[PDB]
């Protein structure tokens, strides 16, 4: 139990964040590179993540091919997501590429289509967030989703391929603000040991 309250910073080359709203408790331990362990108990909403933040001057095409090689001993007890999460600006977009989840597969919307990638099948969704918190304050923005049809807890997530498919399905993306492997908990308890999380751009460390 190293971090037990809202905190944002950098650790061993990765931008990390612990975030929760009121209720229950959570613990995050930062390990080498993109790795970390997380534990949560009776929370309303909690997010643990490690990844990379950007200056917001480049589209994902300008950055290059973004990949995350990961592995998580994922043990949620209730609702939870294992996903690559992040944001773009201009337009402001919050996004999730979900590989596993707890008791509920997100996001409750009508699928806009599929994406075959990294040996799996993902369904694409888009939802609107009205006057909700964001990296730019209270705002109304779109939330994009790629959600695997079956659960997976290791492998490579070809992030750029999801981004290209969202744009091809008419869901535009702004300049990149953040991309990070994330474990989210909702009205639940759980544990997740992210023992591998290697984020590369064009094959190189950011």
Domain boundaries along the sequence of the chain: 1-206
Give the angle subtended at the CA of 160 by the CAs of 157 and 163, to the nearest 5°: 110
Separation CA 200–CA 206 (nearest Å): 6
Residue owning tokens 């994902």: 60
Q: Give Cα separations from 150 to 58, 99, 100, 123 (angstroms).
A: 32, 8, 8, 11
State the resolution, in angstroms: 1.5
The distance of Cα 202 from the centroid of its chain, to the nearest Å, equals 20
> Catalytic site residue 123?
no
Separation CA 140–CA 108 (nearest Å): 19
Q: How many residues can be counted in the chain?
A: 206
The distance of Cα 173 from the centroid of its chain, to the nearest Å, equals 16
CATH class for domain 1-206?
mainly beta
Structure-determination approach: X-ray
User: Helix, strand, or coil here: 172?
Assistant: coil
Strand partners, 9: 16
Cis link prior to 91 (omega < 30° from 0)?
A: yes
User: Helix, strand, or coil here: 165?
Assistant: helix
Active-site pick, 94, 126, 161, 178:
94
Active-site pick, 17, 123, 178, 184:
184
- Do 79 and 187 touch, CB atoms closer than 8 A? yes
> Catalytic site residue 205?
no
Separation CA 77–CA 127 (nearest Å): 26
Separation CA 114–CA 93 (nearest Å): 20
Token readout for 90 is 């201009």
The distance of Cα 31 from the centroid of its chain, to the nearest Å, equals 18
- Do 128 and 140 touch, CB atoms closer than 8 A? yes
Token readout for 28 is 């995050």
Please state whether beta strands 66-89 and 175-201 pair in parallel, antiparallel, or not at all (unpaired).
Answer: antiparallel
Separation CA 128–CA 124 (nearest Å): 14
- Which residue spans within the chain are E strands per DSSP? 7-11, 14-20, 25-30, 36-53, 66-89, 93-101, 113-117, 120-132, 139-148, 154-157, 175-201
Token readout for 133 is 């918190």
Token readout for 99 is 């590989």
Token readout for 44 is 């309303």
């Amino acid at each position: 139990s190293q971090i037990t309250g809202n905190e944002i910073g950098t650790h061993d080359g990765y931008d990390y964040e612990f975030w929760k709203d009121e209720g229950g408790y959570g613990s995050m331990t930062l390990n080498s590179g993109g790795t970390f362990s997380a534990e949560w108990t009776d929370v309303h909403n909690i997010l643990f993540r490690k990844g990379q933040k950007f200056d917001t001057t480049q589209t994902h095409q300008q950055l290059g091919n973004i990949n995350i090689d990961y592995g998580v001993n994922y043990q949620p007890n209730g609702s939870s997501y294992l996903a690559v999460y992040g944001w773009t600006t201009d337009p402001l977009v919050e996004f999730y590429i979900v590989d596993s989840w707890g008791t509920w597969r997100p996001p409750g919307a009508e699928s806009k289509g599929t994406i075959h990638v990294d040996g799996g099948t993902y369904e694409i969704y888009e939802t609107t967030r009205v006057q909700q918190p964001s990296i730019e304050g209270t705002a109304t923005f779109q939330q994009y989703w790629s959600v695997r049809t079956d659960k997976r807890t290791s492998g490579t997530i070809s992030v750029s391929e999801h981004f290209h498919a969202w744009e091809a399905h008419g869901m535009p993306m702004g300049n990149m603000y953040e991309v990070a492997l994330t474990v989210e908990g909702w009205q639940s308890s759980g544990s997740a040991d992210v023992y591998r999380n290697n984020l590369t751009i064009g094959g190189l460390e950011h």
